[PDB]
Symmetry: C3
Subunit: 231 residues, 3 copies
Amino acid sequence: ITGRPEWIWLALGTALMGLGTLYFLVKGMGVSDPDAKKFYAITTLVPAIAFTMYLSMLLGYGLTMVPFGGEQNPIYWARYADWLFTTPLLLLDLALLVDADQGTILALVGADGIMIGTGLVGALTKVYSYRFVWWAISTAAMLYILYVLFFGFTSKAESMRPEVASTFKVLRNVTVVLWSAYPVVWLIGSEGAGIVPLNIETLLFMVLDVSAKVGFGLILLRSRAIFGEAE
Amino acid sequence: ITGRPEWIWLALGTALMGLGTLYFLVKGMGVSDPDAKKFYAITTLVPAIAFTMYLSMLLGYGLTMVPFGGEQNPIYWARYADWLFTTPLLLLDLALLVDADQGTILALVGADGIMIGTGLVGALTKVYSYRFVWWAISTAAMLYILYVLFFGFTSKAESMRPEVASTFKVLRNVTVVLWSAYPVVWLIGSEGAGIVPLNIETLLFMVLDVSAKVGFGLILLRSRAIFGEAE
Amino acid sequence: ITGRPEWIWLALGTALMGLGTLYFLVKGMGVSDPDAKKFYAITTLVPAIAFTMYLSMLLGYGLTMVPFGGEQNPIYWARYADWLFTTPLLLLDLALLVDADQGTILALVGADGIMIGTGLVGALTKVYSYRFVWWAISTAAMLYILYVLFFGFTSKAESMRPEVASTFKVLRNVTVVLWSAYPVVWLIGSEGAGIVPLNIETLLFMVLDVSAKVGFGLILLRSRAIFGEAE
Ligand SMILES: CC(C)CCC[C@@H](C)CCC[C@@H](C)CCC[C@@H](C)CCOC[C@@H](CO)OCC[C@H](C)CCC[C@H](C)CCC[C@H](C)CCCC(C)C
Ligand SMILES: CC(C)CCC[C@@H](C)CCC[C@@H](C)CCC[C@@H](C)CCOC[C@@H](CO)OCC[C@H](C)CCC[C@H](C)CCC[C@H](C)CCCC(C)C
Ligand SMILES: CC(C)CCC[C@@H](C)CCC[C@@H](C)CCC[C@@H](C)CCOC[C@@H](CO)OCC[C@H](C)CCC[C@H](C)CCC[C@H](C)CCCC(C)C
Ligand SMILES: *C/C=C(C)/C=C/C=C(C)/C=C/C1=C(C)CCCC1(C)C
Ligand SMILES: *C/C=C(C)/C=C/C=C(C)/C=C/C1=C(C)CCCC1(C)C
Ligand SMILES: *C/C=C(C)/C=C/C=C(C)/C=C/C1=C(C)CCCC1(C)C
Ligand SMILES: CCCCCCCCCCCCCCC
Ligand SMILES: CCCCCCCCCCCCCCC
Ligand SMILES: CCCCCCCCCCCCCCC
Ligand SMILES: CCCCCCCCCCCCCCC
Ligand SMILES: CCCCCCCCCCCCCCC
Ligand SMILES: CCCCCCCCCCCCCCC
Ligand SMILES: CCCCCCCCCCCCCC
Ligand SMILES: CCCCCCCCCCCCCC
Ligand SMILES: CCCCCCCCCCCCC
Ligand SMILES: CCCCCCCCCCCCC
Ligand SMILES: CCCCCCCCCCCCC
Ligand SMILES: CCCCCCCCCCC
Ligand SMILES: CCCCCCCCCCC
Ligand SMILES: CCCCCCCCCCC
Ligand SMILES: CCCCCCCCCC
Ligand SMILES: CCCCCCCCCC
Ligand SMILES: CCCCCCCCCC
Ligand SMILES: CCCCCCCCC
Ligand SMILES: CCCCCCCCC
Ligand SMILES: CCCCCCCCC
Ligand SMILES: CCCCCCCC
Ligand SMILES: CCCCCCCC
Ligand SMILES: CCCCCCCC
Ligand SMILES: CCCCCCCC
Ligand SMILES: CCCCCCCC
Ligand SMILES: CCCCCCCC
Ligand SMILES: CCCCCCCC
């Protein structure tokens, strides 16, 4: 484990995702509202999945070597197995908050799968220049997601209860800022141009992951928007 | 790229799926009917997924070598990753058109997963004679799907609006004819008996894919069956 | 095939899953109740999936070698591909029986995915002591599932029709007893401590699989709880 300088950030990430999972699990014990139960189930699964994948990276299972640039490059593939399941769950939290229609939910989840799937292909591609073709396709899929979150959901939240509109607006802004950083870290990190070393890259993804999952969840599950209007 | 004679058909397929995706995306911009939005989302995702997998084959990522018959045989595995997601989406288009019940939808999607999954196992199997055992199981799963589309959905469409009944009947006939060709191309192509060479096999799958996805989508999204009855 | 002593139990399992699939398929022909169709579709898919994965193990495709303990250990990875899809389908049978809320269904299916996913990682892990870390995480996920089936569903079934309450109680008890045996067989078998040899381990999993899928299905599909109350 300790033979890799980035191990400290993988261990911290593992701990923070595990602690986040347990807090949400305990906090959700005393909840019977069927609407609130939906948000607790979605939001608790997110850091639980991330916990297992951070642990796999810490123990060395989620790491492979990819030859490109005449070098064997360490690629943590477990990140994409994490994101494949956690990013659509996070979008479902937002879509259920605004009572989005089914067709829009399917478009979001499908574009998200394309985003993560093409990012994985780009991470494992051995022809250096082709890695950035996949990065560009994946980034186009992300821009579609961000467009929908702004010019489809925002207008839908305003016609909703005030507390669900204000909570959505906050979580929307958090998501757009944090998610946009991921393609940048990829491009300048060891998967892309190799400007930033792997140990610093790992620290950046850990800060982003914890903020986008645990921080996101703390804002959502403390809001009254997750409960139905009741007397 | 150009070192493979089949590259021209992979490049054409990539272009036609990309163009198809963009047309459906633009055409769906001016749509607010929640029913129509469902069909546009399903139908636009189909060629978008196929685009990415054709590109992976063009660039050489979606290709592996499988030893059988005393030879290293080029097997494009990316086809099955495509079909795993696009064939159930196409069946969902048909099932939603006739307002199929949930139990029937689950049976269709499950049989479809078995069809594609066993076809993938057959494509990667190293014992030559066993490849055709998997082909037979996969073909049995397809025949179940075709039976349901005829002796379960057809009777349901007649009790529906006339425009949804006539549109379903057309898309049903297109699907049964085109899908039935796939097991035949597999059997006589490089995955099976090896009668037809890979470059011709690739041309045939490209014609079938574009027809079953883009051609299918053009018929559906030009129909009024996708809109609810409104004044 | 016959070069492996466990082949006899893989062949028996294949036959019993295939026969089970055909019986459920025939029995479900004469069913039009939309509620009953749901249970028949879920319950017939379970042994059909298991059939294909037992066949892959029989023919040698679903087997790999994992080095640990200074030895190349035969690991049947196809079991986890089976369980990944069949265990959530079995939980869906139970959840639909008691009309569970959506949030609870998602929590069950998500915990089940974590259970199977971490068990697969543990089966393929090359550092011997780490294999049991994954076993423990997977077992914690199972205990969560069992808790929900007892202290969330049981109370919900009592407020239901008597026949659905008594049928659920029976299937609940069958599930908790049979599922609990799996982590024990893993721990003492070739994936874990290696006390029980592989051929005996394979026999035990076959008895458990057939009972948990075909036996489970025979109890459910003979009950009147799967039909709506009708005159
Ligand atoms: C509606 C939305 C959900 C739609 C989703 C969008 C999606 C279509 C976007 C594209 C996804 C696609 C790129 C997934 C590729 C997975 C692949 C990286 C797995 C590893 O295989 C890659 C190479 C080794 O580098 O295999 C070496 C050769 C091996 C012999 C490969 C044989 C196994 C194949 C991988 C079998 C295909 C399985 C499916 C891809 C499983 C789904 C994986 C997940 C990442 C989507
Ligand atoms: C309700 C419906 C959706 C049900 C679906 C029906 C489905 C059950 C039908 C059978 C599907 C099954 C054959 C999928 C097999 C995937 C497999 C080809 C992936 C590549 O692995 C094959 C060998 C190399 O040749 O791995 C070499 C050895 C490696 C060490 C393998 C270890 C990884 C395992 C593959 C882990 C299992 C992952 C799941 C199979 C992922 C789903 C893939 C998709 C193709 C279903
Ligand atoms: C809501 C719920 C459904 C959530 C589900 C819970 C889930 C997150 C729990 C953890 C699942 C995770 C451990 C799955 C790992 C699959 C992995 C074993 C496949 C084989 O790859 C392992 C190594 C060889 O040993 O690959 C060698 C290196 C290769 C180069 C690997 C590159 C391919 C990657 C495997 C791509 C990721 C694909 C996804 C993991 C596909 C889903 C598989 C299924 C088992 C979940
Ligand atoms: C909890 C994890 C989250 C919210 C991860 C989000 C990840 C992304 C938005 C990743 C995006 C990428 C691109 C847009 C292209 C480059 C490759 C990716 C996958 C890093
Ligand atoms: C857009 C792609 C489509 C509609 C693909 C359809 C593919 C099939 C219907 C494939 C069927 C197969 C068999 C029936 C057995 C032989 C292997 C397959 C997977 C080619
Ligand atoms: C039809 C198959 C069924 C119902 C299989 C159930 C399997 C389990 C409940 C497996 C549980 C495991 C653990 C709890 C940890 C050890 C590894 C597993 C996956 C065997
Ligand atoms: C979206 C965030 C990207 C900003 C990356 C900042 C990295 C600064 C760290 C110093 C770079 C290390 C280079 C010298 C080793
Ligand atoms: C009462 C609110 C705080 C509860 C404690 C939460 C502990 C989980 C770890 C959170 C750290 C990361 C927060 C986002 C920066
Ligand atoms: C379902 C369509 C299958 C028909 C295949 C027709 C192939 C004819 C092309 C000529 C065969 C090439 C053999 C000589 C190289
Ligand atoms: C107005 C209808 C035609 C629009 C142009 C569609 C261009 C997408 C490519 C379609 C070619 C394949 C059609 C099926 C044979
Ligand atoms: C949950 C069931 C686990 C019980 C396992 C009993 C196995 C007894 C078979 C004899 C053990 C073989 C050891 C000598 C070869
Ligand atoms: C009339 C009920 C029996 C029908 C025959 C079922 C045959 C399928 C194989 C069942 C054997 C396994 C039963 C569970 C132990
Ligand atoms: C490729 C993996 C995608 C599945 C991720 C799991 C979450 C799915 C959310 C589905 C939302 C409901 C759509 C109607
Ligand atoms: C194995 C991958 C299957 C999932 C394909 C994605 C489409 C799923 C459609 C689900 C239809 C809704 C069923 C109720
Ligand atoms: C185009 C939709 C408007 C909202 C999206 C904001 C774009 C942020 C740019 C992200 C940069 C990634 C490289
Ligand atoms: C048996 C259901 C009737 C409709 C299915 C038509 C069968 C077409 C044969 C396809 C040939 C594939 C080898
Ligand atoms: C803790 C929830 C109560 C019901 C679960 C029964 C636990 C059975 C123990 C299984 C042993 C697996 C190692
Ligand atoms: C080795 C660098 C080659 C540059 C390729 C950049 C491709 C980016 C595509 C974005 C449209
Ligand atoms: C090398 C050819 C061996 C023939 C096997 C055919 C199997 C087909 C099974 C269809 C029932
Ligand atoms: C080689 C045996 C090492 C023992 C590790 C046991 C780990 C079990 C963790 C359960 C909390
Ligand atoms: C609940 C605390 C979980 C912390 C265990 C993971 C941290 C790795 C320490 C080496
Ligand atoms: C929108 C046009 C997309 C065409 C790019 C793919 C074709 C491959 C050319 C080499
Ligand atoms: C319907 C009977 C299915 C039996 C075939 C599988 C058994 C393997 C025999 C070698
Ligand atoms: C993106 C930063 C999240 C901050 C988490 C703190 C929330 C406390 C209510
Ligand atoms: C299967 C052939 C499809 C033909 C596509 C043309 C549709 C234009 C309306
Ligand atoms: C767990 C044992 C199941 C027994 C199956 C027999 C059911 C006949 C109704
Ligand atoms: C109005 C809410 C502002 C939230 C933005 C937070 C950016 C990290
Ligand atoms: C909408 C604000 C985008 C912020 C992008 C930050 C990328 C590091
Ligand atoms: C490929 C772009 C299509 C141009 C608009 C078609 C008419 C909606
Ligand atoms: C009555 C519609 C006929 C459609 C059949 C088309 C076959 C390619
Ligand atoms: C229902 C007509 C079937 C046509 C099969 C064509 C196979 C090449
Ligand atoms: C009251 C029903 C008892 C069922 C338990 C069966 C254990 C195999
Ligand atoms: C609730 C009874 C548990 C039985 C466990 C059996 C494990 C072999």
